[PDB]
A paper describes a structure:
Here, we reported the enzymatic characterizations and crystal structures of marine bacterial esterases CrmE10 and AlinE4. Among these four residues, Ser and His serve as catalytic residues, and Ser, Gly, and Asn serve as oxyanion hole residues.
According to sequence alignment, the catalytic triad of CrmE10 consisted of Ser29, Asp178, and His181, and it was composed of Ser13, Asp162, and His165 in AlnE4. However, the function of the Asp residue was barely investigated. Although the mutant AlinE4-D162A did not show significant variation compared with wild-type AlinE4, the B-factor of this loop was lower than wild-type AlinE4. In addition, one key residue (Asp162 in AlinE4/Asp178 in CrmE10) was found to be able to stabilize the conformation of both esterases and the metal ion Cd2+ reduced enzymatic activity by blocking proton transfer and substrate binding.
Residue numbers in the entry: 0 to 188
The structure:
């Protein structure tokens, strides 16, 4: 094909950085290769930072854009998972994401928003509030939306790394039952 590559900014967290994976296995790297089959030669800027909250992304969006030799032709924004993990305010996550999308819109950079979903352990009130920020933002900022970015691994624990183990309340009881004998024996009489 003719011409310079199309520049796409992948602005997100561990899901873009490729946490736990080898060189070239991250979502941005594999997406770059897959777009060839759509007639697109892309250069995807991997601006994934593991652990980034919506606030962290807001704090760096201008610097990341100002650091680019070539202005992005599309920005893919994938943030909010770490706010969820931390149980942070969904309202504040929506405010922080609004600031990121406002900067992209100021620069006339098209947006694709990757929708995040809350798991049930946060409870229905939190989960409904969190989940609704993404459609709200996509309509407000005239952004395209992938409603559930992780949908294709939702029912596939074989496609997810064994990483953090946070026992549930019942899991804690299981651990206590297995280890209390050891603790009692270690405590001097």
């Amino acid at each position: 094909s003719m011409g310079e590559s199309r520049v796409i900014l992948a602005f997100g967290d561990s899901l873009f950085a490729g946490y736990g994976l080898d060189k070239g296995e991250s979502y941005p790297a594999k997406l770059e290769t897959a777009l060839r089959s759509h007639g697109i030669n892309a250069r995807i800027i991997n601006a994934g930072v593991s652990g980034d909250t919506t606030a962290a992304g807001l704090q760096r969006i201008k610097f990341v854009l100002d650091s680019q030799p070539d202005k992005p032709e599309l920005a893919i924004v994938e943030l909010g998972g770490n706010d969820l993990l931390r149980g942070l305010s969904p309202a504040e996550a929506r405010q922080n994401l609004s600031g990121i999308l406002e900067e992209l819109q100021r620069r006339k950079i098209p947006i694709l928003l990757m929708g995040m979903r809350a798991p049930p352990n946060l409870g229905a009130k939190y989960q409904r509030e969190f989940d609704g920020i993404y459609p709200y933002l996509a309509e407000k900022y005239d952004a395209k939306l992938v409603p559930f970015f992780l949908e294709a691994v939702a029912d596939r624990p074989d496609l997810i790394q064994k990483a953090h183990v946070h026992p549930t309340a019942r899991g804690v009881e299981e651990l206590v039952s297995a280890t209390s004998n050891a603790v009692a024996k270690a405590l001097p009489a």
